[PDB]
């Protein structure tokens, strides 16, 4: 019936032609003020408050349109408390948890209409945050440009305690979700004037998510004791940065962490990278599965767990066009087990060892599977000892400081 | 009857379309306002003064409230979970009930434009990049 | 399969298989030019004599 | 002559709704070809032409058994019959014959509507890489060669990608003989 | 009432994704040849298709039969929507029952695949729907040799595979994945069988 009030209330409003007139007409919003007393049967329950608040949201509204043709400043100092007791009778024993999400960033946007105070849209992260990912793509947009400016000009860093991350860090992550939730070309001005001051402050202790830049693959070459260790090629978001970017291709066993680099300067789109990678592990093994982490360091680790099961299978095998290496050959050999390792030998020298490795200790070069670890070592002759000997496993890891 | 937003709401509270047909104006001004109506009219579908009943194969039509001189009009089909929900602004309302049945059959079509481009059978099937970008191409055929 | 390298043949292989050896170089960076002698050696050597 | 015998077969003849099923089923299978292959669309017409082919050449005994007719031998009578008691019995709706050759051989088959097409939008990825009817190429090269001619069929262009319409260049290259019956002795 | 196409060629078409399905594994790119302009394509019929299938390996047929579900998945998802502005009142979305949505279904899906109702329709208490019908429609049509009879059931056991993926889709457009098995279970005068989970 208070439904066919609103319709009484759409009634009027219907036949309403002089806005000077129709606010008396607001003045039956007094009437439905004096509807208010006479609805109200009791002193509270959940869906008795529920139906009270809207008729006094809408007179709030009547009341906020009565302003329309501008009292100096207690209109936006007298409007919060109606807001807060409406805020506070929709928040009575219901699943209405949007309005008051929206009930406090309307008293934020009255706060910072004022000088820049203490902040509740900023104060707790979700909260200020409102699902940014899960709500929408513009509502955030405002209430994180807001609190933007909240704390950049309050100008004291001692964060809330909801978690206590006193610092630039807070901002940064703003910074960070305002330009991931922007347009691309208008941004520019949102970039570089809340990326500047990161710069300084490099608190850097930051972990994103990556999805401002984007990264794609290609195939695997070889280079000159290195690997070109897969040429890949990412988006842009942004104006620039200088990151020292790797890939982690692994192994079901081990990581390669190659297609690394030193220096970037990444501005346009289609940034097509080579990834020159040294320690080339595994024998270049093609069983090597992306982990595709891909930790583009620009002042902080924006990394991407890009991460399946879908064993497309990174190959990267091998290649022999003169560089230095160690091999394994017995040749030669007395009427006992042994072995030997020759070496193509270059100018810098430095270590290796070899290690058996087997269900049980089949091969011993001492009384236990040894190292016999050797620097600048040509060629020489390793023993073994006894088991049921058919084929042993190896393994030589050598440092061999050719390369960094 | 020429509306001011429309907007489409899908099985959870995730919005999928909310948008404006007078795209570019001169008032665009923010896109807050058509914005912060719709999240609040997610929140007016567990209201216990109105009530959409479970009978019928036509689904009906509300009028939920009215907000900055805007009135919103809503329908939940109850089986696709379907949560729609348009604006109109004030004056442009007669008050009579042809223009109440337009608005009906303003919903009928573009309850129909969902449907079929949920139905485009090329489509990988998500909230791509490919269906708002084909919404849009269709509502600018619908609203100039 | 050395059991008739001796007796009217040489270089005659035993019945192991080819595909998955191709997509083991198909998978890796080989040329067209390379995998066409690849395969025309391993097609020859599915069976011959010598 | 036929078309009061093609409204005479559609008097008599098991129907269903052509929206809301037979669109959804052939888009439903060039989805599956357009993830299948995984995002390759020049491949896909030409397994939609061999499946097209198999589905045709089953047809045409259907054909011939709900309407009495002769072996068809100039391109005055598959032109007539096709567009007059082909089409419009087995999928309600008639082309019409433009383009027309020298010397009596390759027309054109400019559909109006389509029900394989009907309210489909194609993305923006197969502008200029695939064929959406392609079984329709399929059932004319392997229905027309089962009443013992040959041809070609190729789309020339679609509603989808460009503004003109929906053809078909069917072409007579060749008709095919009838074999005797042994060998020799 | 509606625009209307004819049936029989529509079953032809239901009929035969099982050769497409053949065809598009064991083709990832006796078998024949034909030509096109300037071109060839490599033929195989469907006689010649589903026999490959009884010769099948395990983990060839189980990744076959994986698509015909996923046709029956694709076609159900888009075909609940039409059939939701064709009538479908009195049930939910998140239908914390389950027979008012299996009187939908046998009523209003399977009417407009195949002309009637799902005659018969047993209720285990705990969500274990069984739907049965005894003369299903593509299956009209299929015989093999003389007394033969044994080796055909398995032979055309892929033909069920569309309609696990038919009440798939119609329930995926209602919220969620299940678990489905299909049963032949012959008459009793002048049969096939589908679970719920």
Redesign the interface.
Known sequence: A??LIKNFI?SI??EYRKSVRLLEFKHYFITSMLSYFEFENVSNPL?CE??AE?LML?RD?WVQ?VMATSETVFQENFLTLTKEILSLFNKCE??????VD?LSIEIGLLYYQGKKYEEAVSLFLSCYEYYTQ???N??GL?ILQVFIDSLSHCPKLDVLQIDGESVSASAVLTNAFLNILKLCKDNDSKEIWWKKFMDLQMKVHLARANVSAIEVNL???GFPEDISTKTMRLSLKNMGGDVIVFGASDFLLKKGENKLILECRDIMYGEFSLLSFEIIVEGIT?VKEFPENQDEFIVVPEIYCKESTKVL?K?A?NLNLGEYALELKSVQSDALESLQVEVEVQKNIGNMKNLPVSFSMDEIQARKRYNTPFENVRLEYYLLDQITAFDLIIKTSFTKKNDQ | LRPCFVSLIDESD??IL?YVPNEAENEMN???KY??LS??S??YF?????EWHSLDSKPLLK?I???E?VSVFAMLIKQTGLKIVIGFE?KS?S?ADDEFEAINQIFETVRKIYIRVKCNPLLVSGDEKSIIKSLERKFDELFI | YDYDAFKENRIIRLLKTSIDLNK?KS???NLCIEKAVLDKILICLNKVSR | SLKAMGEEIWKNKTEKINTELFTLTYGSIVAQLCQDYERDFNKVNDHLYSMGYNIGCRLIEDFLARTALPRCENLVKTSEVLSKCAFKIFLNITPNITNWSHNKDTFSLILDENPLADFVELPMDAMKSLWYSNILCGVLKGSLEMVQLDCDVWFVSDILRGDSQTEIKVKLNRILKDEIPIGED | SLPKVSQSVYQMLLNEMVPLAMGIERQISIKRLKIEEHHTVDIIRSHNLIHELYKADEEEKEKVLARLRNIGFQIGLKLSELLIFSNNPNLKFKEMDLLLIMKFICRDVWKQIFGKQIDNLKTNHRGTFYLLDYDYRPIQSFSLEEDAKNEELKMIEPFLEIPVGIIRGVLSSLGYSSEEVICLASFIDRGVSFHVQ
Do not use: M, W
């Open positions: 208070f439904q759409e409003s219907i869906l529920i139906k809207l809408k509204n349109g219901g699943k209405r948890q949007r309005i929206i899960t709500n929408k513009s509502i405002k195939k695997s070459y093609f299978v190959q095998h | 995730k919005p909310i923010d896109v807050l914005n912060v999240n609040i997610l929140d567990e209201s216990a003064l109105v009028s409230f009215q907000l001189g004030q309302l008050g | 083991t998978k890796i960076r």
